[PDB]
């Protein structure tokens, strides 16, 4: 029932424009858990199967078997957005602690943070 | 010509759903400058005039006069998204260093980061 940071949901991202990531696809919850509990929206990063290897420092690979995916995928920490909770469809899986540490580092790079 | 982290642009955020922030409005560039230079997309946080005081730790106030706004506004670090660069319209202003430090801290809170 509770939406947790690091959960992976199916979500309809369309409509989008240009090079924005669209379609119905898995996304990872990256908003903090207090916002997850009490906000009407969540913040997510897109996951794609169209590539299967990290290409840049904002990319994090996720394996087909351990997570519940159609194919080896990659989390795009340069593709983030805020979604009303109604967009979230099936909960598919959730990332390991080690994986989320990779996501945190790519998110720090993506957003120009450093500490 | 170069899009810099901390710049404030007018951008068309619509269409949106539910409690997502929509409409044409100022947004602040929060993506790192390397992504700003070489990606087709930028990552932004929405600014609204519908409130004029920070309400939660993910809110950062910005003053009507120093920045070039219709009214005292607040940056919503819980309202972030990735936009194709074509969405960016007029460049309106850019945040001071001190202001961007406030934005960084709210972004760390919003995204569950800490370092």
């Amino acid at each position: 029932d509770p939406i947790r940071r690091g959960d992976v949901y199916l979500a309809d991202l369309s409509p989008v424009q240009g090079s924005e990531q669209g379609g119905v696809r898995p996304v990872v919850i990256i908003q903090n858990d207090t916002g997850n509990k009490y906000s009407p929206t969540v913040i997510v990063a897109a996951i794609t199967g169209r590539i299967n290897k990290a290409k840049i420092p904002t990319h994090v690979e996720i394996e087909k078997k351990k997570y519940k995916l159609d194919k080896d995928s990659v989390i795009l920490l340069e593709q983030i957005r805020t979604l009303d909770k109604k967009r979230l469809k099936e909960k598919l899986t959730y990332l390991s602690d080690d994986k989320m540490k990779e996501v945190d580092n790519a998110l720090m790079i993506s957003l120009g943070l450093n500490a | 010509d170069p899009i810099r982290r901390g710049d404030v642009y007018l951008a068309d955020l619509s269409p949106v759903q539910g409690s997502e922030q929509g409409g044409v409005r100022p947004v602040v560039i929060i993506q790192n400058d390397t992504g700003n230079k070489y990606s087709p997309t930028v990552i932004v946080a929405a600014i609204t005039g519908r409130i004029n005081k920070a309400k939660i730790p993910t809110h950062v106030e910005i003053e009507k006069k120093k920045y070039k706004l219709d009214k005292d506004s607040v940056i919503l670090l819980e309202q972030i998204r990735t936009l194709d660069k074509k969405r960016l319209k007029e460049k309106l202003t850019y945040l001071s260093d001190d202001k961007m430090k406030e934005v960084d801290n709210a972004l760390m809170i919003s995204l569950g980061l800490n370092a």
Partner: nanobody
Framework: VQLQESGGGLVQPGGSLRLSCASAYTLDYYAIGWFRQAPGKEREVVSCIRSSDGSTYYADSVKGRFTISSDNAKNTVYLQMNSLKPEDTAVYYC??????????????????????????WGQGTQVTVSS
């Protein structure tokens, strides 16, 4: 065959050469870059372009001497090389990937890959700058 370079050869120092990278696909499918490699060294970024917009990357060693450009009608990307130096001698490859221009920007800058992460590569063409 996907990418195919042509236009290498021998030039005296100070000369010019134009390399061509013929893409099997229209240039909106990916960004395209030129790399070079000398014996026993890793392939290094020279210049990159995303043809659908104008965006480019140039390595510090070739700035103001080399120019990358697109010919959409011929699905070809060119590297115009002027004021060539002996130290520009290398095998020159073109490469293509959806994320190539960001790759050029982030790593030239140099965290570290194997460069084999980019999807498409030509066979390489020899550039020799020598008197």
């Amino acid at each position: 065959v996907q990418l195919q370079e042509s236009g290498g050869g021998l030039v005296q120092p100070g000369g010019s050469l134009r390399l061509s990278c013929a893409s099997a696909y229209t240039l909106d499918y990916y960004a395209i870059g030129w790399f070079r490699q000398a014996p026993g060294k890793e392939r290094e970024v020279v210049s990159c372009i995303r043809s659908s917009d104008g965006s480019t990357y140039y390595a510090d060693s070739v700035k103001g001497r080399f120019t990358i450009s697109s010919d959409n009608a011929k699905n070809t990307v060119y590297l115009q090389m002027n004021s060539l130096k002996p130290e520009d001698t290398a095998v020159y490859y073109c490469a293509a990937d959806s994320y190539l221009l960001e790759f050029c920007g982030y790593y030239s800058g140099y965290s570290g890959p194997a460069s084999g992460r980019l999807d498409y590569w030509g066979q390489g063409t020899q550039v020799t700058v020598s008197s």
